[PDB]
């Protein structure tokens, strides 16, 4: 992929976060926090899982960033739409307005429904997240293999504008603890 070019500068939304998420100072790592983390509850949080979004919107053009996953067991990565819900249980999928893979359990899968198995031969340290708004287009990249494809969702119906989304995952392990880090341009 030569998708470099498109790079833009991501920054976590600390309102959407889930209220045990930790956000560094200059919103581009998150981690699952041991306890609540005495913020307010509104209606933006994601309640049910470690969920955050990106400050950016996006409604046109061609989006590309880059994702630090070293050493963690399970995350969910790609972008959603704004009017995505917030509160209980969902599955990420096309129709509840998500482009998403994830690490789970050892195997790597796209949020399709029902899901699908990806074929990785490298464990990615660090993910590339390419969006062309008007193509209807997502895909992700492993850029510890030299940028090999993981998966292209394509005929994608945004309907809408797109956020960047980010799941710490579940720590019950104590194996997940990690951070997720936007990289840098
Ligand atoms: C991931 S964990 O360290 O096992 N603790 C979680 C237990 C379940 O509730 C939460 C999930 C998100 C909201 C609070 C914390």
Known sequence: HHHHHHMVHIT???????????????????????????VSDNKERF????????????????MYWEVDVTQKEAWDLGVCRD?????????LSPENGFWTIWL????????TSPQTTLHIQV??????????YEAGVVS???????????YTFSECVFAGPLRPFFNVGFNYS???????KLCPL
């Open 83 to 91: 009017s995505v819900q917030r509160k209980g249980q969902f599955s």
């Open 123 to 132: 464990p990615p340290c660090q993910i590339g997240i390419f969006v062309d």
């Open 104 to 111: 789970w359990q050892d195997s790597y899968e796209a949020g």
């Open 12 to 38: 976590l939304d600390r309102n959407t976060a889930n209220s045990w998420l930790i956000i560094s100072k200059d919103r581009r790592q998150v981690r699952m926090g041991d306890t609540h983390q005495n």
């Open 47 to 62: 309640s049910n899982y470690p969920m955050v979004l990106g400050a950016q919107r996006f409604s046109s053009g061609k």
């Open 174 to 180: 104590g194996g997940n603890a990690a951070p997720l």
């Open 140 to 150: 992700f990249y492993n850029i510890t293999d030299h940028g090999s494809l993981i």
